[PDB]
Short mmCIF file of C-alpha atoms in Angstrom, two decimals:
data_model
loop_
_atom_site.label_atom_id
_atom_site.label_comp_id
_atom_site.label_asym_id
_atom_site.label_seq_id
_atom_site.Cartn_x
_atom_site.Cartn_y
_atom_site.Cartn_z
CA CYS A 1 -0.03 0.43 -0.24
CA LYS A 2 1.22 3.60 -0.64
CA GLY A 3 0.34 7.08 0.22
CA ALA A 4 -1.37 8.98 -2.66
CA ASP A 5 0.59 10.63 -5.47
CA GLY A 6 0.91 14.39 -5.61
CA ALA A 7 -0.83 16.20 -8.38
CA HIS A 8 1.44 16.95 -11.58
CA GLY A 9 2.04 20.37 -12.58
CA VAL A 10 0.12 22.45 -14.99
CA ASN A 11 1.70 23.15 -18.62
CA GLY A 12 1.93 27.07 -18.93
CA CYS A 13 4.16 30.10 -18.68
CA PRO A 14 6.04 28.72 -16.49
CA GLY A 15 5.08 25.13 -16.24
CA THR A 16 3.91 24.92 -12.53
CA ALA A 17 5.58 22.64 -9.54
CA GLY A 18 4.15 19.19 -9.28
CA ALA A 19 2.88 18.45 -5.67
CA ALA A 20 4.52 16.57 -3.21
CA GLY A 21 3.55 12.96 -2.43
CA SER A 22 1.49 12.06 0.65
CA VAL A 23 3.12 10.44 3.69
CA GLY A 24 2.85 6.60 3.90
CA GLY A 25 0.24 5.84 6.48
CA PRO A 26 1.29 3.16 9.08
CA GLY A 27 2.48 0.11 7.09
CA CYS A 28 2.04 1.83 3.38
CA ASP A 29 5.13 3.31 1.02
CA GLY A 30 5.65 7.14 0.69
CA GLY A 31 3.63 8.66 -2.35
CA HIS A 32 5.37 10.05 -5.55
CA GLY A 33 5.89 13.46 -6.33
CA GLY A 34 3.89 15.13 -9.02
CA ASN A 35 5.45 15.85 -12.31
CA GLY A 36 6.02 19.16 -13.16
CA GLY A 37 4.22 21.34 -15.98
CA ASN A 38 6.00 21.94 -19.32
CA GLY A 39 6.98 25.18 -20.23
CA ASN A 40 5.31 26.70 -23.17
CA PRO A 41 7.88 28.11 -25.74
CA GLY A 42 10.12 30.84 -23.79
CA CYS A 43 9.13 30.01 -20.34
CA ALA A 44 10.68 28.01 -17.36
CA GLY A 45 9.20 24.12 -16.50
CA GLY A 46 7.74 23.39 -13.07
CA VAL A 47 9.76 21.35 -10.40
CA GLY A 48 8.94 17.82 -9.69
CA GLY A 49 7.11 17.05 -6.74
CA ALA A 50 9.13 15.56 -3.66
CA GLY A 51 8.52 12.32 -2.55
CA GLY A 52 6.44 10.75 0.61
CA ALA A 53 8.29 9.23 3.44
CA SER A 54 7.62 5.73 4.15
CA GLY A 55 5.27 4.30 7.14
CA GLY A 56 7.54 1.61 8.07
CA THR A 57 8.07 -0.39 5.08
CA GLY A 58 11.71 1.23 3.63
CA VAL A 59 9.77 2.41 0.31
CA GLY A 60 9.86 6.04 0.17
CA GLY A 61 8.12 8.02 -2.69
CA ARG A 62 9.72 8.97 -6.22
CA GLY A 63 10.36 12.30 -6.88
CA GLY A 64 8.54 14.12 -9.82
CA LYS A 65 10.31 14.73 -12.83
CA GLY A 66 11.00 18.43 -13.89
CA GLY A 67 9.04 19.96 -16.47
CA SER A 68 10.66 21.00 -19.71
CA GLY A 69 11.39 24.68 -20.46
CA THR A 70 13.60 27.54 -20.48
CA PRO A 71 15.13 26.69 -17.86
CA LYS A 72 13.69 23.24 -17.18
CA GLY A 73 12.61 22.07 -14.12
CA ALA A 74 14.47 20.00 -11.62
CA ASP A 75 13.34 16.46 -10.34
CA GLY A 76 11.97 16.03 -7.06
CA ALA A 77 13.63 14.89 -4.25
CA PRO A 78 12.72 11.25 -3.39
CA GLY A 79 11.00 10.83 0.04
CA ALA A 80 12.60 9.17 3.24
CA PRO A 81 13.02 5.35 2.93
#
């Protein structure tokens, strides 16, 4: 079982940030961060959301992928395993 993944960011000018993944409830893995939005031409990409922490399973969430753009968004950092 796993916490909810974060919503992706919106494509736009700029692409917006992906949301952080939710913490894993007791006995659950961390949720994955949302991918960042992609920037329209000339616009920055959104950062990926961070991953959520594990609820004692040793499995944290993945970070989201950054959005493409000028400049691109960074990936989110993973959650605590």
